[PDB]
Design a protein around this ligand. Structure first.
Ligand SMILES: [Mg+2]
Ligand SMILES: [Mg+2]
Ligand SMILES: [Mg+2]
Ligand SMILES: [Mg+2]
Ligand SMILES: [Mg+2]
Ligand SMILES: [Zn+2]
Lengths: 349, 38, 60, 141, 130
RNA sequence: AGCCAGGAUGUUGGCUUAGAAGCAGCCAUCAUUUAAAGAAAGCGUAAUAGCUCACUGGUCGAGUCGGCCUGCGCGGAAGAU
């Protein structure tokens, strides 16, 4: 706990400050601020209480050691084991606490070409094994095989309870440094892959053709029709008040046919506009989440010569790459979530 | 004053009164409850 | 034009006035000038004890 | 007696002075001093128990001076240490949270019988028992 | 306080000189928080600030706009005798500043925050210089 | 029907959330002093506080309050020489 202790110290200080801020009757006159402070106080108080208990236990551990004579092993051992247990309880309790919906996982090659495909296949196998040893379900929707090895792009759907809340930190770039299979000599090569995780969201579409927000104009058509085209209102025009689209029809001699045709065309135009809006929003979100595989923008690195996996977002290096490549990356995602939660409490101003 | 074809008592203070052949509702508590049948 | 910001860490952002001078960064295609550190709205490199005058750091 | 002037009854467990939201802003807008209850209120606290909510009165005059009187802890929290239960009801008929022995409640009724009413002790047994069936408890014979 | 921002960011000379030539005669004070880069502007009351803005707009030709900012009071902190001052200049690094005369300043955010932040860090925090 | 008076007791309840205290919503809806008083029909508070109503004593002093079968009338009811 090298850096998270600083965050918890700042959290405790802010908890004390907001505790003091509630007893002056000058910030209680307004109601929105009072309610905001009241909502802010709860989590701060709980986490601060647990952290103060941990800090006092640690300070006790620091003392009662720099002496001799008595066999101080037993009390030190019991104190440190209870400290570790309390620390584990604290981290879990402020890490858990919504958002547990299914997810879409897609990985594609970056720098490297025929070996980035192999690394993408390996990474997908890792994620699949992780999902399988969680009672989740993974099914492949789109696959583009990569000539020599794995996939140039794989898009699959993972379904379960708690999916997105744990796989939302894998979106980014993953760098691998190792000896490729497609290598005549014995050179080491650096390549990258890009991963995107996106939550599952519905597709609620409604017939927005409520006639209470439509303007209908009926008038005379223009063309060659004799003495009947003159004295008849056969042309129709519908204006949609919310969106502002206008559709005019004077195809056939019957007003009802024109009305039906123009209403259908207006509905089709509204549907197309809405679908285009959703598509562009999703495309922009995916572009920002994905990045650009260039072995220089990355979230984690895998070194096979040294067998080391490192995470640059929290600056955490570990030497258990063989377990990680076997779907045991729960020892990688938990430290991130913790650091992702202390900020959420700290971002309450 | 709501002009409607069906005037009813809406609270405990509403009273039915007929003035010049027009049935109307008046209550001392809520001024929103006064209506005229028309 | 495009200018290069040397040293470790800068406080620059949009709408900041700076002083630039000549000097070409080779492996950067299109960069042809250098930002003078210690100038109007750019501060010297923090905790720099060597070659201070090239990065506008006061002597401690 | 004097009618309500500035006082309403509300207080968390006496055990700690704990100038928390339930006690601080409850009287912070009335003025007075919040930290001062660490001595005035806690003088009677340390005798009874650590962690029992005792209701108090916060009668305060315009001179920013107060005076307080306490009562027995409410019967709802009384059947939490004598029942082994800290959660509560929510389907008091569909399910139940625990059991209470019929001989346990009345032996504690006299603690609240100072301000509880009734013709005699046996009368007050139904009052403490009638409220118990709403909590989800079951009387044990 | 009311920090400053002017429309054209290149005609910023006259606001950087018309504010060192007008804090030389006790009309305005120019803090500059350490973390970001602002030009926060002290005053003792509304009328003094009104005089400053009208004078700065008429004499020096500076078209600017003055946002508000949430700050209660500043305090000049100067205690270099010990070493704990060095760590105080780090733990509370978020809301310190630098005057025109380079004296530090604990730009508070409320009376409660200040009244707390001098209950610990038992160093001197007075409110006058020169 | 008007008019005097009461309209109480450990629910600051776990349930739920920052507070929900008769009155946001979810289950239950007993007991005590009683002549009567809902573990609440309505208004009102951020939550309290505050004001009424069901029910009950007093005055008053003789009729009073709702349905059914039916006759005739009222409103609903705005157009162009
Ligand atoms: Mg023809
Ligand atoms: Mg015709
Ligand atoms: Mg008239
Ligand atoms: Mg008729
Ligand atoms: Mg006519
Ligand atoms: Zn009415």
């Amino acid at each position: 706990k090298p850096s998270i202790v600083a965050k918890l110290e700042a959290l405790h200080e802010r908890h004390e400050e907001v505790q003091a801020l509630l007893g002056d009757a000058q910030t209680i006159a307004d109601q929105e601020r009072f309610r905001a402070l009241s909502r802010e106080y709860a989590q701060l108080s709980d986490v601060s209480r647990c952290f103060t208990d941990w800090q006092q236990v640690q300070e006790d551990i620091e003392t009662a050691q720099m002496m001799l004579d008595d066999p101080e092993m037993r009390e030190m051992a019991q104190d440190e084991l209870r400290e570790a247990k309390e620390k584990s309880e604290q981290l879990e309790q402020q890490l858990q606490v919504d958002d547990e919906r299914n997810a879409f996982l897609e990985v594609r090659a970056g720098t490297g070409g025929d070996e980035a495909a192999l690394f993408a296949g390996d990474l997908f196998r890792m994620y699949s094994r992780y999902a399988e040893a969680r009672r989740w379900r993974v099914e492949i929707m789109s696959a583009s095989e990569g000539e020599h090895g794995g996939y140039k792009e794989i898009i699959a759907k993972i379904s379960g309870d708690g999916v997105y809340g744990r796989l939302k930190f894998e979106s980014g770039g993953h760098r691998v440094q190792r000896v490729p299979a497609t290598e005549s000599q014995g050179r080491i090569h650096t390549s990258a892959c890009t991963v995107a995780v996106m939550p599952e969201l519905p597709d609620a579409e409604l017939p927005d053709i409520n006639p209470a927000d439509l303007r209908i104009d009926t008038f005379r058509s223009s063309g060659a029709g004799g003495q009947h085209v003159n004295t008849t209102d056969s042309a129709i025009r519908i204006t949609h008040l919310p969106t502002g689209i206008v559709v005019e029809c004077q195809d056939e001699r019957s007003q009802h046919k024109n009305k039906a045709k123009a209403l259908s065309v207006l509905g089709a135009r509204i549907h197309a506009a809405e679908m285009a809006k959703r598509q562009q929003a999703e495309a922009s979100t995916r572009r920002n989440l994905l990045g650009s595989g260039d072995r220089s923008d990355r979230n984690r690195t895998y070194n096979f010569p040294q067998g080391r996996v490192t995470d640059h977002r929290i600056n955490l290096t570990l030497y258990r790459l063989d377990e990680v490549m076997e779907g045991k990356l729960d020892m990688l995602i938990e430290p991130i979530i913790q650091e992702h939660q202390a900020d959420q409490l700290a971002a309450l101003s | 004053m709501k002009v409607r074809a069906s005037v009813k008592k809406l609270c405990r203070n509403c009273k039915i009164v007929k003035r010049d052949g027009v049935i109307r509702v008046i209550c001392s508590a809520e001024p929103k409850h006064k209506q005229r049948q028309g | 034009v495009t200018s290069y910001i040397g040293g470790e860490g800068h406080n620059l952002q949009e709408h900041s006035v700076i002083l630039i001078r000549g000097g070409r960064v080779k492996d950067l295609p299109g960069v042809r000038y250098h930002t003078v550190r210690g100038a109007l709205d750019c501060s010297g490199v923090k905790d720099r004890k060597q070659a201070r005058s090239k990065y506008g750091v006061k002597r401690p | 007696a004097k009618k309500v002037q500035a006082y309403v009854k509300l207080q968390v467990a006496a055990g700690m002075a704990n100038p928390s939201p339930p006690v601080g802003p409850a009287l912070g807008q009335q003025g007075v001093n919040i930290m001062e209850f660490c001595k005035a209120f806690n003088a009677k606290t340390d005798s009874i128990e650590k962690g029992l909510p005792i209701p108090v009165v916060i009668t305060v005059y315009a001179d920013r001076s107060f005076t307080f009187v306490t009562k027995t802890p409410p019967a709802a929290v009384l059947l939490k240490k004598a029942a082994g239960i800290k959660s509560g009801s929510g389907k008091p008929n569909k399910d139940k949270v625990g059991k209470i022995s019929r001989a346990q409640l009345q032996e504690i009724a006299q603690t609240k019988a100072a301000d509880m009413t009734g013709a005699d002790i046996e009368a007050m047994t139904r009052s403490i028992e009638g409220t118990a069936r709403s909590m989800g408890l079951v009387v044990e014979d | 306080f009311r920090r400053i921002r002017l429309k054209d960011p290149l005609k910023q000379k006259q606001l950087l000189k018309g504010l060192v030539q007008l804090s030389e005669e006790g009309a305005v004070q120019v803090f500059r928080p350490i973390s970001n880069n602002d030009l926060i502007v002290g005053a003792v009351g509304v009328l003094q600030f009104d005089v400053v803005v009208a004078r700065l707009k008429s004499e020096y030709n500076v078209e600017a706009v003055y946002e508000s900012v949430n700050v209660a009071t500043a305090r000049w902190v100067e205690c270099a005798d010990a070493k704990k001052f060095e760590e105080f200049k780090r733990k509370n690094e978020s809301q310190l500043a630098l005057d025109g005369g380079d004296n530090l300043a604990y730009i508070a955010t409320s009376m409660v925050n200040l009244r707390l932040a001098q209950e610990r860090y038992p160093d001197v925090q007075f409110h006058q210089t020169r």
